[PDB]
Paper text:
We determined the cryo-EM structure of the prefusion stabilized SARS-CoV-2 Omicron S ectodomain trimer in complex with the bispecific antibody GW01-16L9 (FD01) in its native full-length IgG form, revealing 6 states of the complex with resolutions ranging from 3.47 Å to 6.11 Å. The epitope of 16L9 mostly overlaps with the RBM, while GW01 binds outside of the RBM. From different states of the Omicron S–FD01 complex, we revealed that two scFvs of the bispecific antibody synergistically bind to two distinct epitopes and induce the RBD-down conformation into 3-RBD-up conformation. Thus, although either 16L9 or GW01 alone could not bind Omicron S tightly, the GW01-16L9 bispecific antibody could bind Omicron S collaboratively with the help of each other.
The binding of 16L9 with the RBD buries a 1061 Å2 surface area, a total of 35 residues from RBD are involved. The interaction between 16L9 and RBD is largely driven by extensive hydrophilic and hydrophobic interactions between CDRH1, CDRH2, CDRH3, and CDRL1 of 16L9 and RBD. Residues D405, T415, D420, Y421, Y453, L455, F456, Y473, A475, N477, Y489, R493, T500, Y501, and H505 of the RBD are involved in this interaction, forming 14 pairs of hydrogen bonds and 3 patches of hydrophobic interactions. In addition, the hydrogen bond between S96 of CDRL3 and R403 from the RBD and the salt bridge between E52 of CDRL2 and R493 from the RBD further enhance the interaction. The binding of GW01 to RBD buries a surface area of 668.2 Å. The interaction between GW01 and the RBD is mainly contributed by CDRH3. The long loop (226-YGPPDVFNY-234) of CDRH3 engages with Y369, F374, T376, F377, Y508, and V503 from the RBD, forming 3 patches of hydrophobic interactions and 2 pairs of hydrogen bonds. Resides D155 on CDRH1 and N53 on CDRL2 are also involved in the interaction by forming hydrogen bonds between V503 and N370, respectively. Structural alignment of the FD01–RBD complex with the ACE2–RBD complex indicated that both 16L9 and GW01 were able to compete with ACE2 when binding to the RBD, which was consistent with the competition assay.
Author numbering:
A (entry chain C): 3 to 110, 125 to 251
B (entry chain B): 3 to 114, 124 to 247
C (entry chain A): 331 to 528
Write the structure that this text describes.
């Protein structure tokens, strides 16, 4: 569980400070990660390892991990920084807990495309596919991050680069089967015992670490995402 | 799970050169690609462990270089009278079983270990379904309590697959097929090393083979000796 | 005043670190261990501290910290844990189920992998029994597979109990050199020296 301001505010020109509170079970023993998602487009990594930024993220963002809470800062925000900011951390109970989202509103190249959605009969379901194009699939891990329409993000499962140990969430445990096959850098996720509470996008997200994000608790992040399919079971 | 050609019979002994394409890498990290001549009947025989590195045996099958992402074992010019199924296992993954490949029919024509250390088994004739049957492979040669022992089973039609691995003194790693219902236990420290069924789930009908050494992280061990297996023949 | 800094800066930065069969046991004491500086060091990939939290670690005195460094593969860092089996966990370095330190580790595929043949390390593939928690076996006698004496020979009965790695630059993560340094903490009936910045 992570506490995050649901919908903060801000004024142009100056800076704000989005914070995230977590117990010593998730943040105190691991590293926090801040993700940015514009309304309409797929999310993208903003800050990883609590002090580092990817090549695409400019110096307009900074982070700190003072104590058991994380603190973000956007020095000199503008109209382009009006997006959702999500916190995420790997808890020591074999799970990946995400934040809630911060509507910091101020009113003044490898493709990872996936498919396999569509409305289906409740109870059962179909398989979830994923693909890539020349990015050394064996040297990276993959995550499944479903997001209901308009709602926040949540972690489903993770497959490591080795293809061995994998972890599932507290709700998708048992009835979900994630696997990878190095045919064309694919990823198959089979779902069972559908409860109709799964209408989301199911982002097939790419990471940068190799093993499961439980032994590498300082580099685990999430690389360029992929446009997910809108699967609407709706019974 | 690896990719191997189902059969290879065209141009016998001239352009067969079977290979286990697909390893998601430069053919593993330890650079050890196994090749076992699993002839029908007797247990498999070691042919190639390193890239080629042919041990004391037939020298007309060598040059197993890792061409790109596959190890093309040059089998041309060997002979034209053979009816067997070759296998290939190459991996370095920590606790990753099922490293063997699919049944490759390398029959060029088609139509036309005993005194080394020891070879004994249990002979599970008409095994009562489930239960707990113990299979031993008493070896009067090397110590059965110092070297790394292994257990590999194969079923009618299906290929070989790693079933059990036991290290020197402090490891009892099991495979993913049993997932825990199989309890490996080393026998007397100076007699043998046996196994345990522990209420099989009708999938252990495959014949067993107690290998004197590891398969995927292979070591020459001087000589590769296996033991003739027994048919479980479950009665569920 | 904050003076007499720990020599940790000389540990986490070198060229040749160690091997798993002969690992350093640096006993660091009499300094203000500023673990906050250890965070913003080279880009580590693992900082899993099992005993306590790094935030509360800077407010607890200690007697002496045992720094133990070695180099293992990528798929072996999982074996360095308070209780786990493996080719490196029970044959080269084993941690008890009381480790109050950290398992700091980072990839070093920039200076520990050259294309000339890396026959420098080893991991003791052969052994007789599991090593005692925090035990080091610096030996080179030929492993004897029982039932035959060996005054030193290599064939069919007795083999080299050590085997070198195959670290190469043109490989993938998992088969790359990873430098792992653990920091064992202890508190005997002795005055505590290493406390931290106040």
């Amino acid at each position: 569980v992570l506490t995050q301001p649901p919908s903060a505010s801000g004024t142009p020109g100056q800076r704000v400070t989005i914070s995230c509170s977590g117990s010593s079970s998730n943040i105190g023993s691991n590293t926090v990660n801040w993700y940015q998602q514009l309304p309409g487009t797929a999310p993208k990594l903003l800050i990883y390892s609590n002090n580092q930024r990817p090549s695409g993220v400019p110096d307009r963002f900074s982070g700190s991990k003072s104590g058991t809470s994380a603190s973000l800062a956007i020095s000199g925000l503008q109209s382009e920084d009006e997006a959702d900011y999500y916190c995420a951390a790997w808890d020591d109970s074999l799970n990946w807990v995400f934040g809630g989202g911060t509507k910091l509103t101020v009113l003044g190249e490898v493709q990872l495309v996936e498919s396999g959605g569509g409305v289906v009969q409740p109870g059962g379901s179909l398989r979830l596919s994923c693909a890539a194009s020349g990015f050394r699939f064996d040297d990276h891990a993959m995550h499944w991050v479903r997001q209901a329409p308009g709602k926040g993000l949540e972690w489903v499962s993770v497959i490591s680069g080795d293809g061995g140990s994998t972890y599932y969430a507290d709700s998708v445990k048992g009835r979900f089967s994630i696997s990878r096959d190095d045919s064309k850098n694919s990823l198959y996720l089979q779902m069972n015992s559908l409860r109709t509470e799964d209408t989301a996008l199911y982002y097939c997200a790419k990471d940068r670490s190799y093993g499961p994000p439980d032994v590498f608790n300082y580099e685990y992040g999430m690389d360029v995402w992929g446009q997910g399919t809108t699967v609407t079971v709706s019974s | 799970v690896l990719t191997q050609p189902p059969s290879a019979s065209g141009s016998p002994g001239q352009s067969v050169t079977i290979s286990c394409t697909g390893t998601s890498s430069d053919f593993g990290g330890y650079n050890s690609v196994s090749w076992y001549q699993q002839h029908p009947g007797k247990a498999p025989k070691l042919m190639i462990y390193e890239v080629s590195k042919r041990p004391s045996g037939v020298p007309d099958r060598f040059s197993g270089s890792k061409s790109g992402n596959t190890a093309s074992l040059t089998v041309s010019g060997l002979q034209a009278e053979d009816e067997a199924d070759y296998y290939c296992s190459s991996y370095a993954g920590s606790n990753n079983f099922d490293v063997f490949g699919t049944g490759t029919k390398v029959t060029v024509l088609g139509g036309g270990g005993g005194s080394e250390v020891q070879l004994v088994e249990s002979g599970g004739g008409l095994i009562q379904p489930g239960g707990s049957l113990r299979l031993s492979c008493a070896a009067s040669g090397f110590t059965v309590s110092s070297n790394y022992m292994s257990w590999v089973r194969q079923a009618p039609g299906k290929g070989l697959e790693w079933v059990s691995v036991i290290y020197s003194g402090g490891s009892t790693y099991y495979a993913d097929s049993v997932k825990g219902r199989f309890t490996i236990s080393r026998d007397n420290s100076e007699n043998t090393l046996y196994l345990q069924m522990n209420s099989l789930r009708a999938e252990d009908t495959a014949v067993y083979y107690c290998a004197r050494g590891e398969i995927q992280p292979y070591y020459y061990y001087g000589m590769d000796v296996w033991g003739q297996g027994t048919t479980v023949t479950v009665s569920s | 005043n904050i003076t007499n800094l720990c020599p940790f800066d000389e540990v986490f930065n070198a060229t040749r670190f160690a091997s798993v069969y002969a690992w350093n046991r640096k006993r660091i004491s009499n300094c203000v261990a500023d673990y906050s500086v250890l965070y913003n060091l080279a880009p580590f990939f693992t900082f899993k501290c099992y005993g306590v939290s790094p935030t509360k670690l800077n407010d607890l005195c200690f007697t002496n910290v045992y720094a133990d460094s070695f180099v293992i593969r990528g798929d072996e860092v999982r074996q360095i844990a308070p209780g786990q089996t493996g080719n490196i966990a029970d044959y080269n370095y084993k941690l008890p189920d009381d480790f109050t330190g950290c398992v700091i580790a980072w990839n070093s595929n920039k200076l520990d992998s050259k294309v000339s043949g890396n026959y420098n390390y080893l991991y003791r593939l052969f052994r007789k029994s599991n090593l005692k928690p925090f035990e080091r076996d610096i030996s080179t006698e030929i492993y004897q597979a029982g039932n035959k004496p060996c005054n030193g020979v290599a064939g069919f009965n007795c083999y080299f109990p050590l085997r070198s790695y195959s670290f190469r630059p043109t490989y993938g993560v998992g088969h790359q050199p990873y430098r792992v340094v653990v920091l064992s903490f202890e508190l005997l009936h002795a005055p505590a020296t290493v406390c931290g910045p106040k």
